[PDB]
Design brief:
391 residues, alpha+beta, Green Fluorescent Protein, 10 helices, 15 strands, globular, binds calcium ion, GFP-related, luminescence, GFP, Green_fluorescent_prot, Green fluorescent protein
């Protein structure tokens, strides 16, 4: 019956492979350091997403030699939670961060074990001031951080999720073939200055400056933050963002991702190659080049082997499900079906898409699908009915 799921997930998979969701790092020779750019998604409580576009620069505090890396990225897995015995406004954070993006230093020695962390933030967003203190520990062997933060000035005037990126990338796990690309540990113990501008789409921006360095045996991140131009009714000052992660995979969701994986993995060997990916995308009426295919795989290719293996696919789909897609992204998916751009998916346009995915399909399982999605009753699927089908 409902294989709006199978094809829904394949659309989600291709959308993910066509997007840039990681933390992209590049050398900045003029500053003897690095710069980064990335996009963060903050789910909006009532539906929708609030995008936050980050630009970042890091410069070493010391004069010692540092590693200036080839282009690569960090991939972050975050989980936010609450301490049931904590009365104060607070956030508990657990993060695993790994570098990738490149295919197959003295300061790094400071990170072979568990290192205590302290974080201190003083903030001012549209004149609303606040401070946060955090403490915990990092275990870079696994890319792992555990921290608890408290708003020490009372009530935090912005949502906790918007501060996560600001509140120690020296704890990232760099794989063995990428150790010469880890600028962050190479700058230790004297540390680095990290600066960002963060643009919240349709809203204001944060500007941050931080000093990250060892003070005795503790890695300390001391930050100032200034936010301007926020809407007093927007998602940030109006506190409309979801807090809790949404990290639960109902095992049959995993079975669903497996079914989607098999659309790509047509030889059944448990990994997707460029040839397989290209075969799927041509069937959907696209024509990416070999280089575009390699770049798409590289975006999720944790091990650098040039293919997406089943666990790498599960990891990418888990993250795609955790965060809401923007209207622009959903419209792009909708355009895949709405081939004539009239704003309506007809049973003919729908036939075409699935029948190209290899869905041996006839003529009433098709219409049973239209029926499922067809809420107003006009015999077609419009954008708003489509949005729901992608949920
Ligand atoms: Ca395969
Ligand atoms: Ca791989
Ligand atoms: Ca149409
Ligand atoms: Ca309709």
């Amino acid at each position: 019956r409902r294989k709006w799921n199978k094809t829904g997930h394949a659309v989600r998979a291709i959308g993910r492979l066509s997007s840039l969701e990681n933390v992209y790092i590049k050398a900045d020779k003029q500053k003897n350091g690095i710069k980064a750019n990335f996009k963060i998604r903050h789910n909006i409580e009532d539906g929708g997403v609030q995008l936050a576009y980050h630009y970042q620069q890091n410069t070493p505090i010391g004069d010692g030699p540092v590693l200036l890396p080839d282009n690569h990225y960090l991939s972050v897995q975050s989980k936010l939670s609450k301490d049931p015995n904590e009365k104060r406004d607070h956030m508990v954070l657990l993060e695993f961060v790994t570098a990738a993006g490149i295919t197959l230093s003295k300061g790094e020695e400071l990170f072979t074990g568990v290192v205590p962390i302290l974080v201190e933030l003083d903030g001012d967003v549209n004149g609303h001031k606040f401070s946060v203190s955090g403490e915990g520990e990092g275990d870079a062997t696994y890319g792992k951080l555990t921290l608890k933060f408290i708003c020490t000035t009372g009530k935090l005037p912005v949502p906790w999720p918007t501060l996560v990126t600001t509140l120690v990338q020296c704890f990232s796990r760099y794989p063995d073939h990428m150790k010469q690309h880890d600028f962050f540990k190479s700058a230790m113990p004297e540390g680095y200055i990290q600066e960002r501008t963060i643009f919240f789409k349709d809203d204001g921006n944060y500007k941050t400056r931080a000093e990250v360095k060892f003070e005795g045996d503790t890695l300390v991140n001391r930050i100032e933050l200034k936010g301007i131009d926020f809407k007093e009714d927007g998602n940030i000052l109006g506190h409309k963002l979801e807090y809790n992660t949404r990290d639960q995979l109902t095992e049959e969701q995993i079975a669903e991702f497996k079914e989607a994986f098999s659309l790509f993995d047509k030889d059944g060997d448990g990994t997707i190659t460029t040839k397989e990916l290209g075969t799927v995308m041509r069937s959907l009426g696209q024509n990416p080049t070999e280089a575009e295919l390699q770049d798409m795989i590289n975006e999720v290719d944790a091990d650098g082997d040039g293919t997406i293996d089943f666990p790498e696919f599960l990891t990418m789909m888990a993250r795609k499900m955790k965060y809401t897609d923007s209207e622009e992204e959903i419209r792009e998916a909708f355009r895949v079906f709405d081939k004539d751009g009239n704003g309506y998916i007809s049973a003919a346009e729908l036939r075409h898409v699935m029948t190209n995915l290899g869905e041996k399909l006839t003529d009433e399982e098709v219409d049973e699908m239209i029926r499922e999605a067809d809420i107003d009753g006009d015999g077609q699927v419009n954008y708003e009915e489509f949005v729901q089908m992608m949920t």
